[PDB]
């Protein structure tokens, strides 16, 4: 109604600096931006200029975020009430800001900061100051992305109390930079969204005037932060008591792609290898069931074919005959139907062969049968494509192994693929989404072809060609030297003349190209039923390799011999065993010049000179010349070294061979110049040859499914948390830090109260409405007592289990008590009487402890007093009635429906209908007022809100007490809590459980007395298992029926004092660090070193020894370490390099002095990026110290006592240069690969090891087409990396799934 403000976010608009304010990518209008709009509006109403008006905004509520849009116009309406000052910044019909704006002519500013002239941060060292780069690195790590316009704090002290704030004449920027001082005063990791600014005073009269026009250098105004009063004051501005709400950090990019950098054999993989077919025992049964169903179905087909309408009948007799050689229809369908309809967990994704076979046989034998059935099976063709038998060889691992192995060997930038016959047997639907969509460095061009248009390929980035696939000699001549890979899925089995087809197919292969063939090789009579009805000319000439089975099938052994006969080298061969087989072939390579071999075994790089010389003469030699970098040791970086060399010398000549001594079989290869094994390798001319586990293979990064990141495994200690805040359907069970004996969150205020705690094995956990309110996002974790801020979880307080002595106990503990083990203070533990089962005990503690607090501790109930209890059917309501009845009180209670009234009356026989009202209307006020003869109710236990809260205070007597325990308080109510106007009694039982002082021990004794006197009786309850935790929370939230919801953790033993059996629970991973052990962080005084150290501090670590070449040299390092120490962490910063045994000894002398060594981290990096041929040894061994010398001096020291037994984690950070390669970083690649080989040796010896292989990290742009990850997401995958069995995990984010060219 009042001023309408238009914000022009255009190319040259003066208010374009407002797009330089983003939170996790999204552009936002600053929270202190509606203050200026309200400020400018009030001055406009008064008719005065806004910079001559001194305003004061009080209790400014931020309800929404005004999302700015580039090149767009945002119109917001500001409405100010003339006399009272109530203002409203509202975009459209949605409120963005509310509060009260008041102008004045006197002095409004409280602090005297506007009088301060200079900057007190003068003459200080550079290690005692924070600069704009360091200040806004801390904000970026929390999601606050400020552009150059909003980077106002130009310098600050380590405490951030004193700052230099820039004045540029823009008031939205200046107010934001004065709120950044408050944000800079609350170090942490989460993103805090302001929600209430109690006071904001702007006095431009004492503020410096706008800088002259065209100013380039602006003045810095001193700023100060007052912790006593919580005032951020700079210049003529003052922000007081800003309240923020935790915000879930959203991911700017798409989820990272996690892979397992593992070794994969080429030919005939064993069942334990990753290139092997994924045939489970269940699949081998489905294959047999289909085989029996197919075999007998043909028998049924032959005998019933009395009309002779079954062409290929001789073929169906031959197929039936062979099945008999290698061997009722009702039973055959019975076995399959039992397999299909069973849901025993072991369940194939789908049963397509059975489904499509059933259509093949069940179809009647009559006129127009074959034409109709051929149409029917062409309508369910998808079943054959997507079938466990057919998908065993189309698994993501094999598809990626083939597609990337072929890419490592194609020496172009685009990789031309050609899938001939894409209508019958398709491969694009598997190659594209599983392997080719992950490509970042190489481009791919896919070309499907067939007789007709490929209907299913319309949605894929492929090119559809047209010609006859089933007939050679008509292949278009435009396909000569056309494709670097040829895929013939189910094509060579349809060719009448194989030699002619293969000869004509081999011409389409570029020199050095590959041919991929997938054909049936075993149990050839299983799929024949469908190749009988859905094939026209089932006749194919045989040859020297034998006679085609039926007329369209060769056996796997005959397939391999046939390919070998045409001079094809078997690069890879993966037999499914149950059905299909896969061959990858390329033509033999005959060198014209002798290959050059250089041994790169030495880790001191005594060959840098020779390789550099031979690498220089690459582009002046014959095209058939090759450099073979050979390593015969487990530790060698030849694999990642040759990837980086390929980036500047091409893939044409650079080849490599590694032989792993440790796992090389009894017959190790003998690669040495004119050897026998080498020549077999100079003929395949594969870039990377690795002999490990007894077979030649290659290192490939196998993608990890997003479902495996939340895979649940047995865990002795678990606790319930949420995967996503505010979602009650995301509740899971995570690993509990109690496996270390202690509980996360021992920092700050939790370090002051040294409560004596008894470790109890939880058997039942009661679900209260306090947990549902937190779980569903109605209230953030920050409203809870400050002692719970760093706790792993905040769900659950009450429980009933067994203490360490085996006694049955029940009690309330600080969260998480929705767990399997707790550390309950001895002053909060009651003993279960020997008449209650532990199930009944789980319902008593909180319900009655709250009831006594509300009635006898806060309400001061006296004998005979009148009490009004809202929601009498709730557990707290039932407890309140029982406590009140014991005090001989006149009870009035609000019951929703008649079922609740009946339940309460039966539960408490003293309750008559006169004692009951309805929670559906405020008609209880007249009834209660009349029934009390105008005296009112002495105590009101209020849960209902709005007009029921008002109508219930109105019933209070002269001395009556109002106990409001509802959770969903209004905004005005919360401000009353903040302003100390009213006490917040809804998280007081949680606060008394942190202090456990005089006020609690009064409630402990009141409840204990009630148990003895019989007042405290167990309530009716519903027991939910540990897997229905989500459903239990939903049951509590809905409040459809009265009762206590109690999660059953363990089964109570028949005895009464007996040790709890040790058991495991399925739970998601959650890495935790032992607080009594010392964790060494070599290079932990850096970007990821210090931000990872903070992550460990939250997850349990309390003893850090951080190592650097120089120690603390900046004010960001000194401010972080002063934050760990304040939290209660024993930090130690050593200015040494662990490059000699003396240095290694010192770092572990200091570690063992602090405590047993429980973790070693190596984040150290040194980089000299340069061209390989302009690098001497002194410059090639630069990155090799932090990665080859500090990793075997930390690995030698971790393999000796006492480190070996105590050590839990051995993390050696790596880079994707070992998996992708990079330009100029050929020395870093060698160091990063030898580091990964030391970590794989540790796994061989059973020692703990983790090797993160990160691409790029944002907070601590697009390189090789990969977006840098946000650190809050690097620590999310890092946590999964530590709690996993693989050694090397590759984490990288893709800008977008790769398309063609
Ligand atoms: N953040 C990224 O962009 C990114 C991307 C991919 C991978 N990574 C991985 O993460 C690490 C790099 O993280 P970052 O550079 O952001 O932070 P950082 O690892 O903490 O930084 C490297 C640190 O190494 C220390 N250092 C070097 N040589 C040392 C020696 N001989 N002894 C002890 N300390 C030594 C340096 O301490 P001084 O400075 O005091 O000498 C420096 O602070 C590497 O392991 C890398 O593989 C990071």
């Amino acid at each position: 109604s009042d001023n309408v403000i238009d914000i022009d976010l255009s190319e040259d608009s003066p208010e374009n600096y407002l797009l330089e304010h983003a939170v996790d990518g999204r552009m936002l209008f600053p929270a202190t931006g509606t203050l200026v709009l309200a400020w400018k509006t009030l001055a406009k109403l008064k008719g005065v200029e806004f910079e001559q008006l001194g305003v004061q905004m009080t209790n400014v509520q931020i309800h929404q975020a005004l999302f700015l849009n580039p090149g767009g116009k945002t119109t917001v309406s500001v409405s100010v009430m003339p006399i009272t000052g109530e203002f409203q910044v509202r975009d459209g019909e949605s409120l963005i800001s509310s509060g009260v704006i008041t102008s004045s002519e006197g002095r409004l500013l409280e602090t005297d900061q506007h009088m301060k002239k200079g900057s007190v941060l003068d003459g200080k060292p550079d290690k005692e100051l924070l600069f704009t780069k360091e200040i806004y690195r801390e904000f970026l790590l929390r999601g606050y992305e400020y552009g150059a316009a909003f980077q106002g704090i130009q310098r600050a002290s380590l405490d951030a109390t004193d700052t230099d704030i820039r004045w540029d004449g823009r008031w939205i920027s200046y107010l934001d930079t004065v709120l950044q001082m408050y944000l800079l005063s609350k170090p942490g990791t989460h993103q805090a969204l302001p929600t209430l600014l109690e006071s904001v005073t702007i006095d431009p009269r004492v503020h410096p005037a706008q800088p002259p026009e065209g100013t380039t250098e602006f003045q810095v105004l001193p700023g100060k932060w007052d912790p006593v009063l919580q005032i951020a004051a700079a210049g003529g501005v003052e922000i007081r008591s800003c309240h923020s709400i935790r915000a879930s950090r959203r991911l700017n990019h798409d989820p990272p792609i996690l892979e397992d950098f593992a070794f994969a054999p080429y030919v005939d993989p064993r069942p334990s290898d990753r290139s092997a077919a994924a045939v489970t025992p269940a699949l081998r049964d489905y294959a047999d069931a289909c085989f029996e169903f197919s075999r007998q179905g043909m028998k049924r087909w032959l005998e019933n074919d009395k009309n002779n309408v079954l062409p290929n009948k001789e073929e169906i007799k031959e197929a039936l005959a062979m099945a008999n050689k290698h061997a009722n229809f009702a039973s055959a369908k019975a076995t399959l139907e039992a397999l299909v309809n069973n849901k025993n967990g072991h369940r194939l994704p789908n049963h397509g062969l059975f489904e499509m076979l059933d259509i093949a046989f069940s179809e009647p034998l009559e006129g127009d049968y074959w034409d109709r059935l051929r149409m029917k099976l062409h309508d369910v063709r998808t079943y054959l494509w997507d079938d466990p038998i057919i998908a065993a060889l189309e698994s993501p691992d094999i598809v990626k192994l083939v597609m990337e192995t072929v890419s490592d060997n194609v020496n172009q930038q685009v990789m031309e693929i050609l899938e001939v016959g894409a209508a019958r047997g398709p491969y694009y639907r598997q190659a594209i989404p599983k392997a080719l969509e992950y490509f970042s460095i190489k481009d791919w061009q896919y070309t499907v072809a067939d007789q007709g248009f490929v209907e299913d390929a319309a949605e894929f980035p492929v090119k559809m060609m047209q010609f006859d696939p089933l007939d050679p000699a008509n292949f278009p001549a435009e396909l000569t030297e056309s494709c670097d890979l040829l895929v013939l899925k189910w094509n060579l089995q349809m060719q009448v003349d194989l030699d002619a087809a293969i000869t004509e197919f081999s011409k389409m292969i570029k020199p050095g190209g590959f041919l991929l063939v997938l054909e049936n090789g075993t149990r050839l009579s299983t799929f024949f039923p469908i190749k009988a009805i859905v094939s026209a000319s089932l006749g194919g000439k045989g040859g020297p390799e034998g006679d085609r089975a039926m007329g369209c099938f060769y056996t796997d052994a005959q397939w391999s011999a046939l390919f070998a006969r045409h001079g094809f080298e078997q690069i890879m061969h993966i037999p499914d065993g149950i059905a299909v087989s896969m061959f990858l072939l390329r033509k033999p390579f005959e060198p014209s010049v002798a290959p050059i071999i250089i041994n790169v075994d030495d880790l001191e790089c005594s060959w840098l000179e020779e390789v550099q010389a031979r690498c220089a003469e690459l582009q002046d030699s014959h095209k058939d010349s090759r450099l073979w970098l050979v390593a015969n040791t487990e530790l060698s970086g030849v694999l990642g070294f040759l990837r980086s060399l390929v980036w500047e010398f091409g893939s044409e000549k650079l080849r490599c061979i590694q032989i792993d001594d440790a796992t090389a079989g009894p017959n190790p290869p003998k690669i040495s110049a004119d050897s026998a094994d080498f020549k077999e390798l100079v003929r395949k001319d594969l870039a990377y040859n690795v002999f490990k586990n007894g077979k030649w293979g290659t290192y490939r990064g196998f993608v990890i499914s997003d479902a495996d990141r939340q895979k649940e495994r047995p865990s002795e200690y678990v606790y319930a948390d949420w995967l996503s805040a505010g979602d009650m359907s995301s509740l899971r069970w995570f690993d509990s830090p109690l496996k270390t004996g202690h509980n996360n969150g021992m920092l700050g205020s939790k370090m002051a109260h040294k409560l004596e705690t008894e470790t109890c094995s939880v058997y039942y956990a009661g679900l209260n409405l306090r947990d549902i309110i937190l779980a569903n996002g109605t209230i953030q974790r920050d409203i809870l007592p400050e002692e719970t801020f760093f706790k792993e979880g905040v769900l659950g307080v009450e429980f009933s289990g067994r203490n360490s002595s085996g006694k049955r106990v029940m009690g309330l503990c600080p969260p998480p008590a929705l767990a399997t083990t707790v550390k309950c203070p001895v002053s909060s533990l009651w003993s279960v009487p020997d008449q209650w089962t532990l199930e009944e005990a789980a319902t008593v503690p909180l319900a009655y402890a709250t009831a006594y607090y509300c009635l006898v501790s806060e309400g001061g109930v006296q004998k005979g007093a009148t009490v009004f209890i809202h929601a009498g059917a709730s557990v707290v309501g039932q407890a309140s009635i029982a406590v009140a009845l014991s005090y001989n009180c006149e009870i009035f209670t609000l019951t929703k429906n008649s079922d609740e009234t009946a339940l309460l009356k039966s539960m408490y026989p003293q309750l008559n209908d006169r004692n009951f009202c309805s929670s559906e209307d405020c008609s209880f006020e007249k009834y209660i007022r009349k029934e009390t003869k105008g005296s009112g109710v002495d105590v009101v236990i209020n849960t209902l809100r709005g007009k029921f809260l008002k109508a219930s205070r109105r019933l209070l007597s002269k001395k009556g007490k109002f106990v409001d325990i509802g959770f969903k308080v209004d905004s005005n109510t919360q401000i009353a809590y903040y302003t100390r106007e009213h006490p917040d009694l809804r998280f007081q039982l949680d606060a008394l459980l942190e202090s456990q002082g005089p006020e609690w021990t009064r409630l402990f004794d009141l409840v204990q007395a009630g148990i003895h006197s019989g007042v405290v009786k167990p309530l009716k309850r519903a027991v939910y298992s540990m897997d229905k935790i989500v459903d239990a929370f939903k049951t509590v939230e809905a409040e459809r029926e009265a009762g206590k919801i109690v999660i059953k953790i363990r089964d109570e033993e028949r005895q009464k004092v007996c040790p709890t059996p040790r058991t495991s629970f399925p739970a998601i991973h959650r890495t935790c660090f032992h607080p009594d052990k010392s964790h060494i962080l070599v290079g932990g005084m850096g970007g990821m070193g210090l931000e990872t150290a903070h992550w460990m501090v939250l997850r349990g670590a309390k003893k850090l020894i951080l190592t650097s070449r120089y120690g603390i040299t900046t004010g960001y390092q000194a401010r972080k370490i002063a934050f760990f120490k304040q939290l209660g962490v024993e930090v130690e910063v050593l200015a040494l390099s662990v490059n000699t045994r003396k240095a290694a000894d010192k770092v572990f002398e200091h570690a063992l002095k602090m405590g047993p060594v429980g973790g070693i981290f190596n984040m150290a990096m040194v980089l000299y990026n340069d061209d390989f041929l302009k690098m001497n040894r002194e410059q090639f061994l630069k990155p090799l110290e932090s990665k080859i010398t500090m990793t075997m001096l930390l690995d030698d020291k971790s393999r000796e006592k006492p480190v070996r037994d105590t050590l839990d984690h051995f993390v050696m950070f790596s880079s994707l240069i070992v998996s992708g390669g990079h330009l100029g970083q050929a020395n870093y690649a060698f160091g990063s690969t030898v580091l990964e080989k030391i970590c794989e040796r540790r796994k061989r010896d059973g020692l703990p090891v983790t090797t993160p292989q990160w691409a790029s990290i944002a907070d601590v742009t697009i390189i090789c087409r990969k977006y840098p990850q946000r650190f809050f997401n690097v620590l999310s995958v890092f946590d999964f990396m530590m709690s996993s069995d693989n050694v090397v995990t590759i984490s990288y984010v893709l800008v977008e799934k790769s398309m063609g060219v």
Side-chain angles (χ1 to χ4, degrees), residues 38 107 111 166 343 370 436 619 735 763 798 859 884 1001 1086 1295:
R107 192 189 101 121
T111 45
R166 180 190 61 198
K343 316 97 166 180
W370 276 48
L436 281 165
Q619 288 96 308
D735 282 357
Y763 277 56
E798 42 167 354
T1001 69
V1295 200

Side-chain angles (χ1 to χ4, degrees), residues 374-393:
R374 187 149 192 202
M375 261 329 303
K376 288 290 181 189
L377 295 168
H378 180 306
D379 284 352
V380 282
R381 34 165 167 63
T382 281
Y383 300 171
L384 191 58
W385 298 348
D386 319 333
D387 168 70
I389 315 195
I390 300 318
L393 268 190

Side-chain angles (χ1 to χ4, degrees), residues 1082-1090 1107-1113 1117 1134 1136-1139 1162-1166 1185-1187 1190 1212-1216 1228 1232 1252-1258 1260 1271:
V1082 198
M1085 261 290 186
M1088 194 138 33
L1090 272 183
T1107 299
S1108 251
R1109 285 169 290 160
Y1110 294 122
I1112 303 176
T1113 37
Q1117 302 179 336
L1134 304 197
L1136 74 90
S1137 34
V1138 183
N1139 64 358
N1162 184 68
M1163 300 104 160
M1165 152 162 28
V1166 152
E1185 183 186 305
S1186 39
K1187 296 247 161 288
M1190 317 204 335
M1212 303 287 119
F1213 282 45
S1214 210
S1215 44
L1216 183 42
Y1228 189 51
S1232 296
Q1253 194 186 96
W1254 307 115
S1256 297
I1257 320 278
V1260 302
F1271 203 79

Side-chain angles (χ1 to χ4, degrees), residues 926-1227:
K926 199 184 196 231
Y927 176 82
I928 297 183
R929 194 139 269 289
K930 266 176 33 58
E931 279 276 10
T932 61
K933 297 302 140 61
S935 306
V937 298
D938 297 59
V939 189
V940 176
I941 293 103
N942 180 81
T943 78
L944 278 163
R945 324 217 53 63
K947 267 185 175 74
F948 297 93
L949 190 159
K950 273 84 199 149
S952 288
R953 290 196 210 251
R954 255 141 50 195
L955 285 161
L956 286 174
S957 53
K958 293 179 179 179
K959 309 187 245 175
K961 303 280 160 247
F962 189 72
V963 197
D964 187 13
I965 57 184
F967 289 103
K968 316 79 190 153
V969 303
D970 203 346
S971 314
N972 308 127
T973 312
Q974 186 79 66
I975 302 172
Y977 293 156
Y978 289 149
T979 60
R980 313 288 328 253
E981 195 170 328
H982 288 278
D984 194 1
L985 312 170
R986 66 209 168 119
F987 303 101
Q988 208 58 56
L989 262 285
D990 308 25
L992 294 176
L993 286 169
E994 314 293 317
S995 88
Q996 303 245 338
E999 317 164 39
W1000 168 245
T1001 69
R1002 188 202 179 166
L1003 304 184
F1004 186 89
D1005 304 351
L1006 272 164
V1007 183
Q1008 184 74 68
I1011 294 169
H1012 289 147
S1013 98
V1015 171
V1016 172
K1017 274 170 263 71
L1019 314 161
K1020 290 321 114 183
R1021 87 295 295 183
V1023 172
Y1024 282 78
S1025 44
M1026 247 174 66
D1027 51 289
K1028 316 187 288 190
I1029 184 191
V1030 171
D1031 298 313
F1033 271 71
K1034 309 230 189 122
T1035 289
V1036 177
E1037 195 192 31
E1039 300 163 42
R1040 296 171 253 97
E1041 213 209 326
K1044 230 279 157 58
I1045 303 287
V1046 155
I1047 309 290
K1048 179 189 182 179
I1049 317 289
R1050 257 167 280 233
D1051 231 328
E1052 184 183 355
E1053 297 90 6
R1054 166 93 202 273
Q1055 297 138 251
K1056 291 218 185 296
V1057 174
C1058 89
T1060 291
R1062 275 194 29 268
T1063 38
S1064 286
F1065 314 91
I1068 312 180
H1069 57 94
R1070 186 181 171 290
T1071 304
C1072 315
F1073 301 86
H1074 210 304
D1076 286 315
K1077 298 176 148 173
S1078 74
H1079 303 274
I1080 303 111
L1081 281 93
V1082 198
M1085 261 290 186
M1088 194 138 33
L1090 272 183
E1091 296 309 314
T1092 292
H1094 189 17
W1095 175 75
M1096 331 203 319
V1097 162
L1098 305 174
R1099 301 286 262 233
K1102 290 183 68 91
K1103 277 170 192 54
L1104 301 169
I1105 147 152
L1106 306 159
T1107 299
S1108 251
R1109 285 169 290 160
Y1110 294 122
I1112 303 176
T1113 37
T1114 86
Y1116 188 108
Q1117 302 179 336
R1119 159 168 229 252
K1120 247 289 172 62
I1121 264 62
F1123 180 54
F1124 296 162
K1125 289 177 140 131
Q1126 155 215 310
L1127 276 175
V1129 185
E1130 188 176 359
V1131 187
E1132 174 150 1
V1133 187
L1134 304 197
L1136 74 90
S1137 34
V1138 183
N1139 64 358
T1140 165
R1141 260 293 284 205
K1142 267 182 47 52
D1145 299 358
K1146 291 173 187 184
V1147 168
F1148 284 87
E1149 291 174 4
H1150 288 256
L1152 298 159
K1153 156 268 294 151
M1154 268 172 12
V1157 175
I1160 300 162
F1161 294 65
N1162 184 68
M1163 300 104 160
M1165 152 162 28
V1166 152
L1167 250 52
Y1168 189 25
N1169 295 353
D1170 206 27
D1171 288 298
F1172 178 54
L1173 297 190
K1174 343 272 185 276
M1175 212 148 60
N1176 87 307
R1177 206 166 296 182
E1178 181 104 352
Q1179 281 151 73
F1180 188 90
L1181 273 72
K1182 278 288 186 57
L1184 272 63
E1185 183 186 305
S1186 39
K1187 296 247 161 288
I1188 292 198
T1189 303
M1190 317 204 335
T1191 302
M1192 326 202 306
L1193 277 166
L1194 294 176
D1195 187 17
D1196 292 331
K1197 291 247 52 181
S1198 96
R1199 286 180 177 227
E1200 311 165 342
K1201 305 289 197 45
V1203 186
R1204 188 186 261 255
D1205 305 286
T1206 64
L1207 194 125
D1208 273 303
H1209 307 285
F1210 190 88
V1211 192
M1212 303 287 119
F1213 282 45
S1214 210
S1215 44
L1216 183 42
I1217 198 159
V1218 190
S1219 158
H1222 208 268
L1223 194 32
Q1225 283 153 331
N1227 41 12

